[PDB]
Structure formats: C-alpha cells, structure tokens
Amino acid sequence: MKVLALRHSVAQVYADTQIYTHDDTKDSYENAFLISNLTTHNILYFNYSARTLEILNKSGIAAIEIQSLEELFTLIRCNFTYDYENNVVYLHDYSYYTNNEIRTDQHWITKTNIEEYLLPGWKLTYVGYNGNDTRGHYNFSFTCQNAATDDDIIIEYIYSEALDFQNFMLRKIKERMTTSLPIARLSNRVFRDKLFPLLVKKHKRVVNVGPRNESMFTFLNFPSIRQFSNGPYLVKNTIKLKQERWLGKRVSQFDIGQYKNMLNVITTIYHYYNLYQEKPIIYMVGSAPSYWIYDVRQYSDFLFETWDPLDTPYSSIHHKELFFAKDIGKLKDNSILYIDIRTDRGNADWKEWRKVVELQTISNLNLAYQYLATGKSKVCCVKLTAMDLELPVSAKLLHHPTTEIRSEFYLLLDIWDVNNIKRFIPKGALYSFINNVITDNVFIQSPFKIRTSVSDYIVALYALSNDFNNREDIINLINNQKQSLITVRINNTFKDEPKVGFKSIYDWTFLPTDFETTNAIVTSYDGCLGIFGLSISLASKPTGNNHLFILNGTDKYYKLDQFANHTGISRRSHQVRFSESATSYSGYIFRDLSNSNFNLIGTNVENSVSGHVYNALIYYRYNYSFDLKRWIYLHSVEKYYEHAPIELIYACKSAKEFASLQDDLTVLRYANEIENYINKVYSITYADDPNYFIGIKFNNIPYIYDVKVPHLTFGVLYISDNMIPDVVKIMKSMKQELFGMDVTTSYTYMLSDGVYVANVSGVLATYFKMYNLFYKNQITFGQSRMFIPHITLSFSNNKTVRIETTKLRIKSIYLRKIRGDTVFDMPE
Amino acid sequence: MKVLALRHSVAQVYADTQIYTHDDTKDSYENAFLISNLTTHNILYFNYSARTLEILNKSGIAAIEIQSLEELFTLIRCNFTYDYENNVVYLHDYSYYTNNEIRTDQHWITKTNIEEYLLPGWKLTYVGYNGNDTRGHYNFSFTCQNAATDDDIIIEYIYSEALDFQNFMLRKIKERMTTSLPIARLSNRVFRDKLFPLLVKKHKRVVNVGPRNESMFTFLNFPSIRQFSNGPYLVKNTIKLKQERWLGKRVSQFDIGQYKNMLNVITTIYHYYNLYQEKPIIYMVGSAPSYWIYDVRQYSDFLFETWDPLDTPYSSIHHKELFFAKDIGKLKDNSILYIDIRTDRGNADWKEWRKVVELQTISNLNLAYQYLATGKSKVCCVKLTAMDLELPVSAKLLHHPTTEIRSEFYLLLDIWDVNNIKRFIPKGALYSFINNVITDNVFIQSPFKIRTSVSDYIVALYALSNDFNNREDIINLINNQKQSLITVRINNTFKDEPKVGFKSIYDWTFLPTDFETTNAIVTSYDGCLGIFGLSISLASKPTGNNHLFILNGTDKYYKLDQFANHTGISRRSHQVRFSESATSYSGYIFRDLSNSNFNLIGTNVENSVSGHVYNALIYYRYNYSFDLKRWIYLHSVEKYYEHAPIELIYACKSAKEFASLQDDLTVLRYANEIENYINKVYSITYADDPNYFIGIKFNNIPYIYDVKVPHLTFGVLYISDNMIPDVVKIMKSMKQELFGMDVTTSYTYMLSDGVYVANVSGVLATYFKMYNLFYKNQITFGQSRMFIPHITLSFSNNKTVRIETTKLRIKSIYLRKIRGDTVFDMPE
Numbered sequence A, B: 001m002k003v004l005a006l007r008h009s010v011a012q013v014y015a016d017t018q019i020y021t022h023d024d025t026k027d028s029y030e031n032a033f034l035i036s037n038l039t040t041h042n043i044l045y046f047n048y049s050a051r052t053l054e055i056l057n058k059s060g061i062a063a064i065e066i067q068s069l070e071e072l073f074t075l076i077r078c079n080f081t082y083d084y085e086n087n088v089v090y091l092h093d094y095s096y097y098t099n100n101e102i103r104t105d106q107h108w109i110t111k112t113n114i115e116e117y118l119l120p121g122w123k124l125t126y127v128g129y130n131g132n133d134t135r136g137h138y139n140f141s142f143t144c145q146n147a148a149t150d151d152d153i154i155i156e157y158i159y160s161e162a163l164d165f166q167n168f169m170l171r172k173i174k175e176r177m178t179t180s181l182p183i184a185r186l187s188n189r190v191f192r193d194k195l196f197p198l199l200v201k202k203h204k205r206v207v208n209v210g211p212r213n214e215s216m217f218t219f220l221n222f223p224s225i226r227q228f229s230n231g232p233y234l235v236k237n238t239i240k241l242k243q244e245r246w247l248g249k250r251v252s253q254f255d256i257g258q259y260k261n262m263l264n265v266i267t268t269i270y271h272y273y274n275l276y277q278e279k280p281i282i283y284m285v286g287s288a289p290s291y292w293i294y295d296v297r298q299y300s301d302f303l304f305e306t307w308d309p310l311d312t313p314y315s316s317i318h319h320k321e322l323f324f325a326k327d328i329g330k331l332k333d334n335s336i337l338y339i340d341i342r343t344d345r346g347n348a349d350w351k352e353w354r355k356v357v358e359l360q361t362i363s364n365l366n367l368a369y370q371y372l373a374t375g376k377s378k379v380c381c382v383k384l385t386a387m388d389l390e391l392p393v394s395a396k397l398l399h400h401p402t403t404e405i406r407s408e409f410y411l412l413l414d415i416w417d418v419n420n421i422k423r424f425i426p427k428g429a430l431y432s433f434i435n436n437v438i439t440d441n442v443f444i445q446s447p448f449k450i451r452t453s454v455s456d457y458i459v460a461l462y463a464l465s466n467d468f469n470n471r472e473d474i475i476n477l478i479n480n481q482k483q484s485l486i487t488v489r490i491n492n493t494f495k496d497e498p499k500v501g502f503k504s505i506y507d508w509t510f511l512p513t514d515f516e517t518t519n520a521i522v523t524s525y526d527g528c529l530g531i532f533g534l535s536i537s538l539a540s541k542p543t544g545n546n547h548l549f550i551l552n553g554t555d556k557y558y559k560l561d562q563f564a565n566h567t568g569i570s571r572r573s574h575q576v577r578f579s580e581s582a583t584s585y586s587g588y589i590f591r592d593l594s595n596s597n598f599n600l601i602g603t604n605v606e607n608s609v610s611g612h613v614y615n616a617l618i619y620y621r622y623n624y625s626f627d628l629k630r631w632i633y634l635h636s637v638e639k640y641y642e643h644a645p646i647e648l649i650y651a652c653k654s655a656k657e658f659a660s661l662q663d664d665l666t667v668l669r670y671a672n673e674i675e676n677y678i679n680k681v682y683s684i685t686y687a688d689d690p691n692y693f694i695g696i697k698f699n700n701i702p703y704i705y706d707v708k709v710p711h712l713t714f715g716v717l718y719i720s721d722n723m724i725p726d727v728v729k730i731m732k733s734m735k736q737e738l739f740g741m742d743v744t745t746s747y748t749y750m751l752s753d754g755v756y757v758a759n760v761s762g763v764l765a766t767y768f769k770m771y772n773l774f775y776k777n778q779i780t781f782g783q784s785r786m787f788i789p790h791i792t793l794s795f796s797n798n799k800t801v802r803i804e805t806t807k808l809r810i811k812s813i814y815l816r817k818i819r820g821d822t823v824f825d826m827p828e
C-alpha cells in the first residue's frame, strides 16, 4: 500500500499512474482507517501527524516520511519492507540488472572463476548481508539499502543437475522480468533476522521447527535454540541400498568446493548445538583458502584454528603449514574437528593413485577416533572415499554437493558413536549413497513431536501444514498451548477444499475458526510484521500461498485497535460498491433483503446493521488480517466502539445467503463457524411470544390514522412479574437518552398486509444500548425478527406518502402488559 | 457373478455371450476360490457339491442350483438377489415393459384415474410387496418373483413439481433403457426386510439413523426400535417466515389425496412409537375410501375404526356413517386420532364458502384439545386451513404433498403440546409454509447424537458420511463401540480426496484403515449380504457409490474363511496378467524388482512372496470386500494357512512403489496405513549386524568353486550367549523338515559384484516357519534385506551356467559364530 507522507508546503501531484491523495485532520485513528480502505497501491498523504503513521506501520502498512522529491521520493517508489523503530528501508528492487550485474551476499563466490561463466559483460559485486553494503549509495532522511540478491540462481543451479550456466541464468533472469515479485519470500529474511534475537531474550528459550538453508546463518549466534527437522541419514540405513560403481558426474562448471566446506562445518555446529547448549572452538585441517569464513563472521564470532600448507586469509590462528597428523592430545575438548586431509592427482595412473586415497581414509578415521577417545563435547566431520570400511552404525553421512561427483562423502561423529557400535559397509553401498542422495539441509536434527509444552516458546513458520502431519495434533498444539508463534495456511479457495498443493505435495488448509484459543491473535503476514516492528509495502493477494499467523500468550491480545485491527476491512467492498459493476447501495440493499426487511430499503443510507462482520466474512480472502474472533470476544466483555449482539447474527445470516447464490461453500462454513461461536461466548434469548412491552407515546402524529392510540412499541420482553422492579431501573437510568434522541418521521409504508405504519428513525442506537443494559441483568428482550421501529396508523392497504423530515417528541414512555388493563411504570 | 450350477448328465455349452465353464473336484473351498477369481459375469458350473455353493452364497456370490433348461435356466439369466436359506430369488428385470405395463406395490394407485394419464395402451397391475404376487407366474425348483417396480416414477413425479405425466414417464422409462441398473439400490429393500426382524430379537433394542421414505412401511410392526432423523418443523419456527397469500398451484394430474392420508397417519404413528414404545389403536374420521389400508396390513396389523358417510372397504369397524363430532369421551386412550373433517365446494361463492372452512377449523381444534385433555398416550393429527389461529408452539406441522395446493396443512399434537404453551400465528405465515415447504419424510424424530453406547445396537446405513457431521465423532462411534452395523463410504477415487459428492452435497470418504476396531468386520455390500443370509448376482464397480460396511461385536469375527474371506481377491489381477496388455509374469517381476531381488526374476514362477496383500492394496477398489486387517490380526495369533511376518512388509513396500509410478496417492496412503499396523499387532526385529548364523553343509556341489567351504547360510541371528540353549531346541525340533525338504540347484548367478553363487530352491517354506518359532520365543532372526538363499562359489564375475535341476542333500546343519573358531550345535 506504501503510504508516502509529503511535506506540507513542498508537495506535488503530477500525471502519475497509481496515485490517490489524502489530507485531513478529523482524527488520527479514523484517518488511518479511511486511508487503509483506499483502493490503489501508492498513496500521497500531504499533511500528517506522526501518530497516523504509527498506526499504519503498526498495522503492517508501510507508511514513511518523505522530505524531498528528486531521489528520496522517486526511488522510494519501488516496493520495500520498513522497520518503523530504527527507520530502515529494505528495498526489493531488481532494477540493478540495468548496470549489468548480479549481486550476492556470500564472499566466497567472488574468488571463483564464475565471471568466465556469466553472460558477456556482466559481473557480481556488493556482497553484504541483506545488502547492508548498499547503504553507501543513498543519502536520505532514513537509512536504506537494497536487499535484493540473486542467491536463488546460484544455489538452485548447484541443486539443479544442469551444467550450462549462461543458459541457466538467462532463463531465471527472464523469470523475474516476467512473473510476480515474491515480496513475501524476500521479507522473511528481514523478519527472521530481528524475530529471534529479541524472542530469545524475552522468553529465555526457543524451539524452531523445520528450518531450511534459508537459515544456514540465522542461528549461528544462538546455541540456546533447539531446532528440529527431518532426521539424518545414518550408516544404519545403507543396508537398504543396492550396490553401484563409480559414476563420474559433473554438474557445476565453476568450482564450489568452498560451499561444501562451508556447509559441512555448519552442519557440524548445529549438531554440537543440538547435543550441548554451548558453542565450540572450530579446528580445521586441509582447508586453506576458506573465503567462506568472512560470511560466518558477519553473524557469529568463532575462533577458527587451521593447519594447512597454503594461505588462509581469514582466521584467528593459522598455526602451521604442516597438516595436523598425530599431535592430537594438544587439542582442547570444547571443540569440533573438521578433517579434509586430501591430495590432488597429477597425471599419475588412477589405478595406482587410488591406493593413496584409500590409506588417507584409514588415517583420517584414526584421527577421528583418537580425537573422540579422551574428552567430552567433541564432534568430528571426516573425509572418506568409497571403499569397504568399518563404520559406526549410529553415525551420520553427508554428501552436500560439490563441483563433480568422484567418489567421496563425509561422515560426522558424536561421543556415543564410538561406544561399542561398529558395522562393516561394502564399497558399492557408498557409491549408491553418493550418486543419488544429495543432502538437502544442514539441519539434520530429529523431528518435532507435535505436542504442547509450557516451558517452550515454539516457533513454526513454514514447517507444519504438510499433509503427513496429523491435523488434530497440530490443531491441539495451537489451541491447548501458550508461548508460541505458529503459522498455518489459509483455505484461500472455494468449495472448502481441506488440502491444497502444487501437484507435488498437498498441505492442510485452515480457516481462522478452527481454533478456540484463549488469548491469541490470528492474523496475516503483514499484521505480524507490525507486531514485531515491521511493515511492508505490498498487500497480500486473495489467492496464492497466504498463511495464517498465530501468536499465543502475548502481551498484545487486549490492544485491539492497534495490532491486527479493523484496518483494511472495507478496501475490497469500496471497489465493488462504486467501481466494479454495481450500485453504491448494493451492500446496503442485500443485507436488509436477506434479513426480512425487504419491504424497506429506503433507510439503508444510515441505520443499517452488520457493518464490520459482513465484510469480514465474504471478503475474508482479502482481510483475514483482521482477526474477527478476537474482535468479538473483547466486546462480549469490555476490555471507542459498541454494537449490539443482535447485529452480529444478521451479519452472519446474510453472508450465508450471499455465499449460497455465489455457492462459496467456504464462507458458508465460515458463517456457520462464527454464529455458533457468537452463541458460545454469550447467549442470546428471545421473547418470541412476550408478556410485556415498552411503549412510547407522542404529542401528535403528522399523518392520517384510524388506530385509536398510535404508539411506538419500542421493544418487547418476557419476564417474571417481580423483575418489574429492576426493569424500571433501566427506563429510569436512560430516561433522557430516550427523551433526548432525535426521533424523526418522514414517510409511511406497508409493514405487512393490513398493517399501514409510519417509519421512525434515529432511535436504534439507544435501542441497541437498551438491549445490552437489559442483557447483562439477564432480562430477555427482543424477538428473532428484526426490530424495525414503526408507528401504527391503520389496518388497511394504502400508498406510501412522503413528507418533509418532521421531528416527533415524547409525551411519555410506558411499560405495558400485553393484553392487560394496567401498567406499573411510565417516565415523563 | 451369478454362478449357475447345472445337472451332471444334462448340461449344454452353446454360442453364448458371457460364459465360462468350470468343473473339478479338487477341494470344496479351493474350487470356490478358483471360481471367484474368474473374469466373466455368468459362469456354468457343471458338476458340483452343495458346500461349494454354500461358500459362494456365504461370500455374497449368488450361486444356485439349476435343474432344467427351457425356463429355469433362460429366465435366471437376468440379475437377481438370492436368499440362500429359504431359496427365494428376487429378480431385478425390467423386461416386463414389453407386455406394456408398469407395476407398483401400493394398492391405492389402482383406484385413481391414472390409466387415463398413462401412454396409450399401457396399464399397471400385479400389486404386491417385493413382487410377492409375481411368484404365481413361474414354476421352478426354487421360489421366485420379480421385485422390480416403478415406484420411482410415480413418487418422484409427486415430488417433481412437473405436471405432464406422459412426458414424465416417457423420460424415465428411457433412462432405465439407457443407463445402468442400480442394483445396490434395489437389493436394499430385500435387505431391510430381513435385516431388522432378526436383529430386534438378537440385540433386544435397536436404533436406526436416517430413515427415509424408502422405509415408510418397514418398521410399522416394530415399536421397540427408536429411529432418529432430521427434526420436525415446529410452529415455533413460523416467526421466521415472510407473509404470503393464497397460491393456487396444481402439480398432479391425478388425485393423490390417498397418499397424504396415508403419510399423515404413518407420521402420526412413528411419532407415537417415539414417545411410547407401544403401538396404538387408530381411529379416523372424514376418510372413507382408504384404499391405502391394504398396503398397511401387508406389514403390520392395526385396528382401524372409521367414521365417515361413505364406503370404507378396508377396516375392522366402520362404526357409523355419521362423522365423529362431539361424542369424544367414548374413545380409548391408547390411540391416535386422525381428523380430516372437511367439505367440498360446489359452485358456491368462494368468498362466502371460505367462512365454512374457517369454522370447521375452529371445531377440528376443539376436537383435538378435548381428545388430549383426559387420557395419556394420545396423539392427534388435525386438518387446518390457513387463517389466524392460536396454536401450540411445540407442535409439529405437516404438508405432505397433495393433488394441488389450495390452503390447507395438517398439525399433529402430543400430550405436552397442550400444557400451557400457546402462540398466535398470522394468516400469511401459514401460506408461506404451505407454498414453499414440502415435507420430505414421515420420520420427523430428533437427530442422533453421535456418541457410543453399550445397550444400543446401532444401525446406520446411509445416514452418516454427510459432510456436516463431525468426522472424528463418527470415527470414534465406529472404533470405541460394540453392538452395531454401520455403513460409510469408501474413498473410491485417486489423489486421496477426503470428501466426495455430486456437486450438490459432499460426503466424508474413508479407507478401511481409519479404524482400530477390536472384533469387527469391515467389508463391502455383497459380503454383508452373505453374513445376513443373502447373495447378489452383480459385482460392485471400482468407482461409483461404494460403501464400507462395519459389523462390530458379532459372532463371526473368528470365522475367517467363511465370510468376508479371500474370495474374489485375484479377479482383477488375472485380467491384467493375461489379457489387458501385459505379460503373465508382470506381477511376478515387479515385486522382486521393488524388493531388491532385481538381479533374479527367473525363480518368480514359484517361491515368490507377497501374495494376498499386494493384490488387496493396489486393487482395493475392486476387492475391499476382503477385510485385509481382519486377515492379519487372526494370523498374528492362531485363531489352513500361514505366511511369515516378513512377507507382508514386502507386499506393502511394493504397493508403494507401484502407486508411486502410477501416482495413486490413495494406495500410497493405504500402504503406509497397513505397514505400521503390521508393526503394531506384532513387532519385527532385525539382526542387521548379527553375531551367529545357521549353516547347512552339503555332500557335493555340482558346480565349479574356489571358496574352500561352500555352504548355505540359511539364516542369521543376534542373540545373547546363553540363549544358545533354547535356540538349539528349534535346531532339534525341526531337524528333519530341513533334512526332508527338497533342496535343489539348477543354475549360477551374480548376487553382487565379486560374489558368484548358486541358487537354492524349495527351502523357503521351512525358512518362513523357522522365523516364526524363533519369533514367539523372542529371538531375533533375519535382516531387513530379502533373504535370497545362495551357495557361494567364487569371488569373481562369471557367466550364468544352467544345469539340469540337480537335487542336493544335507551333510549337516550347524550354528556358527560369526568370526569365531567354534560352534556348539550341529544336527546330523
């Protein structure tokens, strides 16, 4: 939506493409609301106060100050993510292709030969995390940087099994200039970066579920988190594999040895974090060039100590040019040891040189056992060729990709992988692992058992919703659990399909109303950006991979008009009402017809009902950022605004009817889901065949009438005959809000056959309060019909006569017994 | 399938269209099995014994004796349902259209004018229940009758809102001669007729869920059943309805007053059964012609006492030609009173004649209250026009259809509908009920709360599976419940769609493996016909509205090879193996490839594995009549046949692979559903890196070999060193089943690289038994690999050499320690 707030005396409207203008000082909250229901994508907000920007930025709507026009305004056009507490703009613009470069955020790729393999004239540069080395280009009122990088192209290529690179990047560079900016995917690495370091301090613990190599680096300075994912591959499960022979396969023009050397270490550490909640010393041998070190130090600071003949530019201590051979007792315990002692064949005979590779492998294991023989908290990660070896069963294999597959895989070990566990593995049982099994993830820790906990702050962002997880176990994990941040997918389709996918995998799909939480928000992506200190410039789409977010047990459940609020509620309706092929009164006509006020749709300008909810139900696909359920519970019990209980049912009933004609079975369910939850948090009682009624007499009715005493039957009630004395409290306590309300009549109509009446206006708000006042005193009031206030005139069938809006005022009020000869109260 | 058993010396094969022949005396149930896996639809079985027919008829396969050819054989061609205990054939042939008639089983339609409204030349006749008046036409070795009637055409027409009848029947008569005979629909009224009268005595109390007007007459002689359905419409819910005026609507050329007069009584009774498990006297007034009485007496015998000026042919006592006016104390209590006191306008003025209709209505209510003022167990059903009246809230309205809508509806009352409950109803609130609300069902009793019970024998045949019922509540109703007969729909589609429908309503879809019952059958429609004394001639289709049946807590759980047995298991495979575009060994090749015996598919003629289950998994859509789960649990614990535990996993693993290539995600689930249930009822242990092994030495190996001692490693085991003394028991107890088994070798092969071996044959059955005796003695034995028995010859790579099948015999057996220098047992 991208609100751009411009200087009062310096501000221009030009022939732009998606620009509305807004300017007012009516209210801070009410102005932001009126903005947030505006249609277009780019809005100029000419005279402003900081609090109207606060509310929007809190609502996930990116709203920012603009002080100048030449570059501060033209470059903040493009889409972005805004941290509204440190005033940093994370742009997501792929217009940097124009000066003919790609850009990464990993230093190691710059030292490859890749620029030989890019298209002619292109380069890569500006290597910083989130583009934090972009900010040197711009000089604004705010800090700014373009976090768009092409990590996708390079990393997918490695996992792509394709060999021509120019063909590859030319394909993908054309995909972005064709298809939609995946803004939600890009904004997550921003979200993840600030999401954890504050969460860790606030709760003192955290568990994450399903981390992928999106987060290879997020957690390197967080030992005290415990991540769970797909389990590892074990030596225990090589016995499955059919035998196979050397397969010389090349899948990368440019050498990516530094990438696996980075991943195998990183895997080794998250393992060490899994076992002990501490973080190690990191010894190394055989790995000099190590341009992947500087990538690591941008996140967490580790002590790297290396033994290699060649240059290690990036380390604390490069101890020797000798490679660590048997001086093994000189190592500290709190450690990991990464062994990559290797060789390179020259032109020597492969059949005889193979003998050398076998002997190193025997040695490299002897180093591993002697390491793990003495001290505790020691992990290894050792180099192996594919030959017959005696390996521990419970150990974990790794084959992160490389330049080319030529028979080697790495093994990592723990202290208990030595304690009397050993198996013999044949040769071709390893090649069968090498050649077909690519390791996908450095996070090889055990799966998350789906059950509630009370010490755990559980995060689960894109791990659950998979079809293979028990639906009810995740539901109960969400309902019967405090302390979390869970994400699940919304049922964004019609005909209520419970499982939705890509023709590869299906995922479980939810509505908001699957969950009877106790104190929790259930909002969208943009809403939770606001909760955690962020705001985004692009709105969510009605279809596509939208996801419910669920915050349990948080400080922000009571702060309703701040976060996950009624912002954005009517944005799509206003499009339908005025523009997209309908009359402006379409919603004002339908809901009265569907609630049996179909004779009268004149007074549907004002005094209609079913405001917030009817929009929340039929356009949930757009505005599920508004947690409807949280809105209702906090008005059951006053913890601004107030509507009667009755109005919410009519909002539900009309959405059913609407979804029936449309045949949108998902709204139709969602309407059923709500209305019996409305009848849950509070009951509703109906004096269907009442005994008493509240009546209002007037001085003079400016109409023709044959009924001997015209009156307004203001409401009916069914009570016991000694709760009269506490009914009369209410008439007495609000006698002037009835004498003081603008009763007006302007016309006659036909309420029904043989019942010719007037219309009364301007009274309902008092009627809705009166229903609430009687309610909590446990007094029945009102019928299941819609109370349309009317003054009876005659039992005939006549013509609607219009007069000027003539004010009527109150003779008296009275509480009358139906078919009785006496009353007991009448204010005056 | 329709097995027709022909006389030995009198039996003919002619140029017929779907005829196989079968004839053998091998073994009774093995013969029926071989039959039941035959392809075609009509089978001649030339020389037979009664027990082979018993098994099939018990298996739901209709199998019958044929003694003659001219008419006993030619007319038993057509499809039918067979009661194999009373030897009655219920034919389902619509060839009676040829002599130009329709046929009903309700006497009242014959006295209408309908034959004026049939197509020219047609008639209707032969009015008996199930066609029980057909049997006078045929003189066979068995009783027989054609239960095909055209109740559909007439009854749908009444509920169709269409007015031209010739156009109607001509449409539907053409639907049957176009589309498929719905047998699963016609055989149910047979099923329902014998299903309840035996069930009521056995369980002592029966509840049925969702009865429709399929069963208007089934239950009239069963008070002690308690039916539940959609609740009634109440006076309480007229307050919803918009006001409306007289709507003169004609929807039936022929008068169907007798139909509503039948339904309103019948509704009145099932109500009385609901309140008081009882059955009443049935007084009447205003209803003389009453040709619907004889329909009632064909099911249950009631005392009907009528007051009407005109002829009542069918009753016990037509007391007077005066109509029951105020002599009301002369009635017995245990009763229902049906009031239809009415009039017929002549040419009198409708505006003045209307006054008469109003006064009767006031009177007809006075009769109703005076009735229900004195005695207990009294139920009324009274005639009303649409006018303003003072009605009880809790009463129940009825507008079963009629000739034409001209402002009348009937009301029924109970004893508590009078006890200080009354409301005023306006005129047009009734017309709005009349004109739009057609009553659907005489069964207006309250819904079934979906929860388990221990006194209840619950039937639920086609009521559950609806999308609006909580899935888990019905699941737990099936799992956590004994004493029932539940039906649910099968997931007959691919891509595992949980809810399936007609684009009108969706219904919850199941697999068999959703349910961990304790002692229950989960079979098809045809299987349960066998259980209850029936058998059907048409097989179920792979797609269409197939339904799981679930019998809990019944005497027949242990009788495996009788009911819901392995009958029919391989019918579709044999079609695929030989005919439908594949080699006969296709299944014998695939399952070895998918279980890593892919080097060898020579010995897949015999000694293959995964027999019953692999067919039960990939063709479940055809043979879900075989409850796979019941088959497995009763072989976990011996309560004929025996296979090893190991074989069932390989059956599951191969179905996964099969369903992966096909991408049939439902088998793929169903395979996962089973294999961890296999690992549930019993564990499996694997000596993956064993310590000991069982070895077998031979006199002389007729091959070339370089290993110093060729041997058969018959099996491996991982045990403690003082469970040798109870391993040797089994070494001893089966020493001759090893010496006595037909060890044979016929060729060499390559088991793997550098391992050149022979093949051993004919030993596995002993190997599978041995696995079980070590098993229940809690001894590990076998690896996760498939044990392919082999004699090692040389560590080279050579050519398969074939020899004649040469028998090898045992020098000795021995239990050896892996890499040890001693043994401790060797039989000889």
Ligand SMILES: Nc1nc2c(ncn2[C@@H]2O[C@H](COP(=O)(O)O)[C@@H](O)[C@H]2O)c(=O)[nH]1
Binding pocket: A037, A570, A574, A611, A641, A643
């Ligand atoms: N009673 C009530 N009315 C509202 C509320 N919010 C908006 N409205 C009404 O709905 C209108 C929405 O205007 P629109 O967004 O359709 O132009 C407002 O001008 C106001 O009349 C609310 O919270 N409570």
Ligand SMILES: Nc1nc2c(ncn2[C@@H]2O[C@H](COP(=O)(O)O)[C@@H](O)[C@H]2O)c(=O)[nH]1
Binding pocket: B037, B570, B574, B611, B641, B643
């Ligand atoms: N072990 C075992 N084999 C069976 C069983 N039933 C059938 N078979 C085998 O499977 C074959 C099936 O023959 P088909 O029906 O394919 O012509 C039988 O001839 C027999 O060899 C059984 O219950 N157990």
